[PDB]
Amino acid sequence: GRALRVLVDMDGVLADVEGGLLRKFRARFPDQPFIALEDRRGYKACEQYGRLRPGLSEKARSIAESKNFFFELEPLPGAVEAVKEMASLQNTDVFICTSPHKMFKYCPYEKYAWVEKYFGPDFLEQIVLTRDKTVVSADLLIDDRPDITGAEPTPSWEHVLFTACHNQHLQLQPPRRRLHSWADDWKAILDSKRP
Amino acid sequence: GRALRVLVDMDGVLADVEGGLLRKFRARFPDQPFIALEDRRGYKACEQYGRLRPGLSEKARSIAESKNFFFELEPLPGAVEAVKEMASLQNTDVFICTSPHKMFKYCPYEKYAWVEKYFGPDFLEQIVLTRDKTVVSADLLIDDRPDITGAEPTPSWEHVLFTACHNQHLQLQPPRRRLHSWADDWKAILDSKRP
Numbered sequence: 001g002r003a004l005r006v007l008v009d010m011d012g013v014l015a016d017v018e019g020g021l022l023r024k025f026r027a028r029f030p031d032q033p034f035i036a037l038e039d040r041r042g043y044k045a046c047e048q049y050g051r052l053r054p055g056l057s058e059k060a061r062s063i064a065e066s067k068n069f070f071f072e073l074e075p076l077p078g079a080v081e082a083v084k085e086m087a088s089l090q091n092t093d094v095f096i097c098t099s100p101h102k103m104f105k106y107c108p109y110e111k112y113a114w115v116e117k118y119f120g121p122d123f124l125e126q127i128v129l130t131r132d133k134t135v136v137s138a139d140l141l142i143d144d145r146p147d148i149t150g151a152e153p154t155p156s157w158e159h160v161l162f163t164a165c166h167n168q169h170l171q172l173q174p175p176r177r178r179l180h181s182w183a184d185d186w187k188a189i190l191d192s193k194r195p
Numbered sequence: 196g197r198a199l200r201v202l203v204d205m206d207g208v209l210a211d212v213e214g215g216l217l218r219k220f221r222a223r224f225p226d227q228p229f230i231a232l233e234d235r236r237g238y239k240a241c242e243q244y245g246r247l248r249p250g251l252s253e254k255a256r257s258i259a260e261s262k263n264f265f266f267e268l269e270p271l272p273g274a275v276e277a278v279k280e281m282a283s284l285q286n287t288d289v290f291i292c293t294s295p296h297k298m299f300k301y302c303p304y305e306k307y308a309w310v311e312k313y314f315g316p317d318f319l320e321q322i323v324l325t326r327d328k329t330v331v332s333a334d335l336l337i338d339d340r341p342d343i344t345g346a347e348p349t350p351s352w353e354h355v356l357f358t359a360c361h362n363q364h365l366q367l368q369p370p371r372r373r374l375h376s377w378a379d380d381w382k383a384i385l386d387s388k389r390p
Contacts, residue, residue: 005330005346093346095330100307100322108303108324112295127295128331129303129324135200135290136323137332137351151200151288156332 004194005138007097007128007157008083012144012164014096015073015114021045024063032056037165043145045166065103070110071117078182080118087123092190097128097136133157139193142179142186146170160189199389200333202292202323202352203278207339207359209291210268210309216240219258227251232360238340240361260298265305266312273377275313282318287385292323292331328352334388337374337381341365355384 011017018037026034033056035048042048046064050057063069087094096115100108108129116124128136133143134150141157144164148155161167161178172178179186206212213232221229228251230243237243241259245252258264282289291310295303303324311319323331328338329345336352339359343350356362356373367373374381 003346095327100303100324102319104304104307104311104319106304108295108307109299109301112299112303116299124297124299125326127325128327129295130322131320132290132323135332137330137347151198152332 001091001195003091003093004140004190005093005095006086006190007095007133007136007138007141007143008086009133009141009143009145010096010098010111010115012076012166013142013162014076014079014083014118015070016076017073018045018165020069020073021060021063024066024069025060028063029059032059040166041169043147043166064101065105065107067106068110070107071113073114075118076182082182082186084119086186086190087126089190091194093126095126095128095136095138096123097130097133097138097141099131100129140190146172158193196286196390198286198288199335199385200288200290201281201385202290202328202331202333202336202338203281204328204336204338204340205291205293205306205310207271207361208337208357209271209274209278209313210265211271212268213240213360215264215268216255216258219261219264220255223258224254227254235361236364238342238361259296260300260302262301263305265302266308268309270313271377277377277381279314281381281385282321284385286389288321290321290323290331290333291318292325292328292333292336294326295324335385341367353388 022034022037033052035052046057046060049060083094086092098111112124115127132150133141134152134155138157140160142160142162144162144167146161146167148159161172163178163180217229217232228247230247241252241255244255278289281287293306307319310322327345328336329347329350333352335355337355337357339357339362341356341362343354358373358375
């Protein structure tokens with residue numbers, strides 16, 4: 001039968017982008033103010049730094065643009081184990097669908113290398129790099145961004161919001177769904193989209 | 196109204212991969228035999244080099260894996276001008292949909308940089324990097340590979356074959372279509388998929 005196709009974005013779902021940004025920002029700019037994760041709001045971290053103090057958006061971006069930022073990101077709790085199990089389920093195809101952002105120098109390569117490091121070479125085959133997820137056909141999309149953007153007004157996938165510091169204060173209105181973490185019942189969400 | 200969505204793969208359609216491989220192979224390995232473009236058959240160039248002489252698949256691959264291989268590729272005749280015009284047509288969205296191959300170090304980055312060089316920064320937004328084009332939804336796909344591969348058995352796009360040295364000897368059976376070059380009537384092909 002037809003496989004359930006699930007898209008999972010790496011950022012803030014598999015790899016701890018927010019923790020990495022905060023940790024490296026503080027080490028490189030120890031005499032500047034920063035944004036504790038609990039105070040993060042909205043997916044655009046650099047823009048919030050810019051509101052904190054003029055110039056900090058640029059410094060935060062320079063952190064994310066630095067060599068090894070993406071590669072040295074820590075996996076989120078239970079992320080690698082859940083996605084490995086998910087991909088091993090019958091009638092389930094998992095693709096990692098994630099953005100190069102506007103940082104083409106190191107980000108694409110390190111994202112490939114990160115996935116290979118934690119998931120193996122085989123899994124590299126399942127990666128789709130795109131700014132626009134709406135042109136990718138699938139049954140489900142799990143990512144940390146509450147807003148959909150891209151060329152297709154109504155995507156084929158149901159969008160499921162993975163909890164992150166910047167989105168956790170949003171109280172989603174049904175039937176919009178939230179996955180609180182990888183300890184949460186993700187199998188139930190997948191099963192709901194099966195025949 | 197709904198925009199016509201056209202996927203165009205860079206390799207052998209916008210950027211002259213075959214000419215670049217041959218030119219750099221010959222300069223780096225001047226005392227080895229090579230495959231003239233007229234003798235190329237099948238999209239897998241390294242495999243054909245391997246059949247020519249044991250070890251040459253590895254050398255050909257080392258050419259494509261080298262820094263600046265992708266970035267220094269020459270645009271194919273009329274390619275940049277056609278795609279710029281195509282993207283400027285009303286009710287037409289163009290995405291560049293292309294593979295990282297298994298060469299993650301320089302290939303993704305240089306493909307982004309190549310597109311920016313010839314098409315501008317804006318156009319980077321329209322790039323989709325994937326091994327599997329069948330999970331990308333669209334009306335048309337133009338690439339140089341005669342065979343479809345990927346998870347979706349029947350893709351949403353019509354596949355149009357762009358002529359390249361390795362595929363030109365294939366006589367396509369209707370209704371399969373071929374675009375002979377960018378001087379050919381590509382507008383007619385697009386128009387045929389419009390309402």
